[PDB]
Structure 1
Amino acid sequence: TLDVQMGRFMETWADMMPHHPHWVNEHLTILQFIAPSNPRLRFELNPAFDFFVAPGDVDLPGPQRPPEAMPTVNATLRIINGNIPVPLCPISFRDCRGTQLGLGRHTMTPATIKAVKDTFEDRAYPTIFYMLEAVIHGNERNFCALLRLLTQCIRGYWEQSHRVAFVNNFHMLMYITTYLGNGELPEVCINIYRDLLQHVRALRQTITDFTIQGEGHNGETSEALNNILTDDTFIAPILWDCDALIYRDEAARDRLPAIRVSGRNGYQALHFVDMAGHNFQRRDNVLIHGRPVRGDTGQAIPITPHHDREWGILSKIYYYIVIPAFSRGSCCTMGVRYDRLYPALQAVIVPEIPADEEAPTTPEDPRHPLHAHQLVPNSLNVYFHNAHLTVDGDALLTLQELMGDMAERTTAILVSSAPDAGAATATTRNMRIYDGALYHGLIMMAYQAYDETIATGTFFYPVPVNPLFACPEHLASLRGMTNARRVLAKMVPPIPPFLGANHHATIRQPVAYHVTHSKSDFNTLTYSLLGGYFKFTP
């Protein structure tokens, strides 16, 4: 259930490494890297390959306990040219190249830069937004079922702190821009969301600008052969629906794929789980797709993607450029505890308003839902009152008809594939790339440790899969954390081996070091990260 696996990893990792890893020392300057005392110097020969030591006679992926064998030198493909180590490809050069790329393209006005930077560095961000984002789980039906509640919540969070809500996950700003953009929200909020979306589309247009169309080999489009954010084989760090897996499985089709979803290979993709058959402690590989609206759910009906292929590209661009450029290595991806989240959402104390009477709006009357007389402990009214937000009775009653569509639990997806047809010779087919993803996972911007109104680890437990989303401070939410584990994970980004390793993944340590140790700007950082994500295939 991804709790026992994380606990086993944290127990084994306290004595797995007896020394400093050789791939995390990326703070070396060029003069110190070049010097003969460096032991990594003899393993840097080819600019398109990473060389390391590896166990012998092991078929990746292997068992949980690493088998004992003699070490042999293995190689892997540096897919990105941003994976070149920072002493060899510096930060100042990357930022100047990003300045060159963003010459006349779209930039963000300083108002949305300041607001998004404030809401990304906020430690008092209310957890009711996280519970709402977890329980909606990126379905259009639930979002338009909750339009009044989300409008009141975003307005109440905006005109009390001048910050922007629901910005962590990608399937909220599309739904806010498309639906709550005609005047339901105030004028500044929709301008901020539209500016973020305009910047994402400008990054996509910049990707299309620097490639040459009409050159497609073996069912791979030219942008996917040039860039990575337009490659359909590579998937988002978190998933909400099974459309990206369908596009990846139909897109590659010759580079040998293998996807492992909590045990045996392959996914089942059964949608429309309701109250009658939820089964929170499910050990299968069944993934919840959600309800498509224009059609029927059924049982024998084959599954279709909700959205276009451009949605996956924009989600990858958002999660891999805009989120790390704002958070700067502080946000962390975690799953949710649905078996504790769902009973906590069933307590609503909306009162009984009599007929031929007006619904109360201000919270100063006894008939309001957030009046103190109906502010019973251990409810949802206490959750909304702790966040100091005003909602009405019907806005709290819409969750009851949200509850017909639900998600069971989060799970860890490890996909794998051969390198693309541009750089697939007779010896690179044995080399495989392994990257991980979180189905129904969440991302929090900043972590608070001293907010004791909610006990730590009640709903979310840290399971990080990226060097970008490494969270050395979010690990206190995990049950049973010692100071030795904290000072061990401060220097090394803790990634579990059942979600991919650093040397076998696509996004590696140097791009994370570039995103966490650069102080240039926010537009030029995004364009520099986009200039990072270009393939080194010939």
Structure 2
Amino acid sequence: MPHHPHWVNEHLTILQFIAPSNPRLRFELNPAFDFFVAPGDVDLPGPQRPPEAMPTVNATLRIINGNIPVPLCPISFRDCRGTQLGLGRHTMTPATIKAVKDTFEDRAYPTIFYMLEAVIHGNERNFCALLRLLTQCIRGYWEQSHRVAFVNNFHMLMYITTYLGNGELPEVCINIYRDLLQHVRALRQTITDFTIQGEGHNGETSEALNNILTDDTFIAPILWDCDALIYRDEAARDRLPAIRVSGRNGYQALHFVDMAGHNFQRRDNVLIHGRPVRGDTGQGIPITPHHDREWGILSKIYYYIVIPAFSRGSCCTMGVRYDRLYPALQAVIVPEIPADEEAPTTPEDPRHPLHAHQLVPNSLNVYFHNAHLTVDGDALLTLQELMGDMAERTTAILVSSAPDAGAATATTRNMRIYDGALYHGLIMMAYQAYDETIATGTFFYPVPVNPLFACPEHLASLRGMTNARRVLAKMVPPIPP
């Protein structure tokens, strides 16, 4: 990288992007295209090492009308065409706005929530048994900080609003989540009037072609299930799909895993999701989709629009180092009650799991102290049912497919679009990088995929992030090739 940072400066103005001194100006020929230099005699990833070959221009398509470089379609035009569009539709009140904002720009996020949000890994079963602890945590957070939590997953938002808006939480703190969901509901509903239905060609009906979030071949950066792939099989029936699971083309799956056959170091092209919540259990029907495509076309709109616009750029995903969370999640201290006695609620009783007696060094019960939560045995010991379901490892997958039928010509199929994304990963908030009470490089490690998730403050967490390296990260979105 450090020789001639190229394709990097995007501060220029159209007055300057057209100057006779622009060394890039000679490469703008087809608005629906993007020209560049590349190594020749290569067609696919191959090795991680770029071979030797004289430079050669290739052809890539510009899909979205947002791809256009900034000094050709300035910010002002876009956020004014937005007003032209967003006329009189849903607008979120200053209350919820200030709330979620202060949530995002606060480095006081309890790490415990990251832990819990990760270890549940999306299944319905390991939620409907943990509900008590979740309400306790969210209450003990909001009702003292006035800041909601659990804004790092869409599965989580539609798992809360589906079963927790019945009074178990305050009317306004769940009104926040209700509003956040109905906002993206309206954001999908808007696209309906911008479409002319009734010309379903090659499967991709009218609703799905003009918009990427309506496309089921391009996936969110983070997922826990295989719904993307099970809708992908219905597509790509002529679009020449391409899969890659940690060095292997195919991919294998299981219905659900146990706590015994752990294998922290699985080598295969294997993937696991939570559980068939009904039906059968074994090898009769191997794979079952978790939800309907409407859950998908609603899944990634959140990730691609909402989280970005809220973080204001200070968002960067981090790949989980689970090998010290599932081992650490089973260091609980649950005190039982005598058969004839009641249950404490105050932290002044020696059988309240946050009493000044039950603090043990190197115990999972230190987190709730550091984040000042409320817990009981009923809500705590309801955690340890991870034997029925436990997600092993988070990997990255390279997928791809051809352009649509809309740009399907005899010269365009050799210009495939590649897609990488983390499975079982994690999208994270503003990074702190100035705490000590927890070991840094032990729980998560930053693996960016989307140039929306390339925050530089989220980089020192890697082992040996020397200063001689941190200088360029402030210029480029670092992405593993």
Shorter-chain TM band: over 0.9
Q: For 1:320 and 1:335, how far apart are their aligned partners in 2?
A: 18
2:266 aligned partner: 282
Deviation by residue 1:503-528 (Cα, 9 ceiling, x = unmatched): xxxxxxxxxxxxxxxxxxxxxxxxxx
Q: For 1:338 and 1:123, how far apart are their aligned partners in 2?
A: 22
Check if 1:77 corresponds to 2:45: no
Deviation by residue 1:442-482 (Cα, 9 ceiling, x = unmatched): 11111011110001111100000001111211111111211
Q: How far has the Cα of 1:279 moved from its partner? A: 1.1
SS in 2 for 1:261: coil
Q: Which moved more, 1:19-28 or 1:441-450?
A: 19-28
Q: For 2:200 and 2:314, how far apart are their aligned partners in 1?
A: 38
CA contact (8 A) 1:228 1:234 kept: yes
If asked which structure has higher relative contact order (CA below 8 Å, sep 6+), I would say 1
Deviation by residue 1:252-288 (Cα, 9 ceiling, x = unmatched): 2111110111111122121311111121110111111
SS in 2 for 1:415: strand
SS in 2 for 1:128: helix
Q: How far has the Cα of 1:47 moved from its partner? A: 0.3
SS in 2 for 1:437: strand
Q: How far has the Cα of 1:250 moved from its partner? A: 1.9
CA contact (8 A) 1:271 1:290 kept: yes
Q: How far has the Cα of 1:225 moved from its partner? A: 1.1
Question: Which blocks of at least 5 consecutive residues in structure 1 are unaligned?
Answer: 1-16, 498-538
Q: How far has the Cα of 1:302 moved from its partner? A: 2.0
CA contact (8 A) 2:329 2:364 kept: yes
Deviation by residue 1:202-226 (Cα, 9 ceiling, x = unmatched): 1101111211111221111112211
Q: For 1:19 and 1:31, how far apart are their aligned partners in 2?
A: 27
CA contact (8 A) 2:254 2:286 kept: no
Q: For 2:99 and 2:134, how far apart are their aligned partners in 1?
A: 19
CA contact (8 A) 1:334 1:463 kept: yes
CA contact (8 A) 2:360 2:366 kept: yes
Q: How far has the Cα of 1:396 moved from its partner? A: 1.0
Q: For 1:352 and 1:206, how far apart are their aligned partners in 2?
A: 54
Q: For 2:172 and 2:467, how far apart are their aligned partners in 1?
A: 44
CA contact (8 A) 1:145 1:402 kept: no
Q: How far has the Cα of 1:104 moved from its partner? A: 1.8
Q: For 2:276 and 2:120, how far apart are their aligned partners in 1?
A: 14
Superposition TM-score, scaled by structure 2 size: 0.98
CA contact (8 A) 2:336 2:377 kept: no
Q: Go from structure 1 to structure 2 and tell me whether the alpha carbon gap of 1:209 and 1:21 turns closer, same or farther (over 3 Å shift).
A: farther
Q: For 1:285 and 1:25, how far apart are their aligned partners in 2?
A: 38
Q: How far has the Cα of 1:388 moved from its partner? A: 0.6
Deviation by residue 1:77-112 (Cα, 9 ceiling, x = unmatched): 001110000100110000000011100211111111
Q: How far has the Cα of 1:22 moved from its partner? A: 2.9
Deviation by residue 1:28-57 (Cα, 9 ceiling, x = unmatched): 001110001111110011100000000000
CA contact (8 A) 1:146 1:402 kept: no
CA contact (8 A) 1:242 1:269 kept: no
Instruction: Flag the structure with higher helix content.
Output: 1
CA contact (8 A) 1:271 1:287 kept: no
SS in 1 for 2:84: helix
Deviation by residue 1:218-265 (Cα, 9 ceiling, x = unmatched): 111112211111101110110111111111222221111101111111
Q: CA RMSD in A?
A: 1.0
Q: Go from structure 1 to structure 2 and tell me whether the alpha carbon gap of 1:337 and 1:271 turns closer, same or farther (over 3 Å shift).
A: farther
Superposition TM-score, scaled by structure 1 size: 0.88
Alignment: residue pair count: 481
Q: For 1:448 and 1:403, how far apart are their aligned partners in 2?
A: 33
CA contact (8 A) 1:166 1:172 kept: yes
Corresponding residue to 1:313 among 297, 308, 314: 297
1:296 aligned partner: 280
1:251 aligned partner: 235
Q: How far has the Cα of 1:142 moved from its partner? A: 1.0
Q: How far has the Cα of 1:402 moved from its partner? A: 3.5
CA contact (8 A) 1:219 1:252 kept: no
State the percentage of identical aligned residues.
Answer: 100
Deviation by residue 1:391-421 (Cα, 9 ceiling, x = unmatched): 1111110111134210000000111111011
CA contact (8 A) 2:255 2:286 kept: no
2:146 aligned partner: 162
CA contact (8 A) 1:22 1:40 kept: no
Q: For 2:44 and 2:312, how far apart are their aligned partners in 1?
A: 32
CA contact (8 A) 2:311 2:429 kept: yes
Deviation by residue 1:321-351 (Cα, 9 ceiling, x = unmatched): 0000000221111211111111100111111
Q: How far has the Cα of 1:20 moved from its partner? A: 3.8
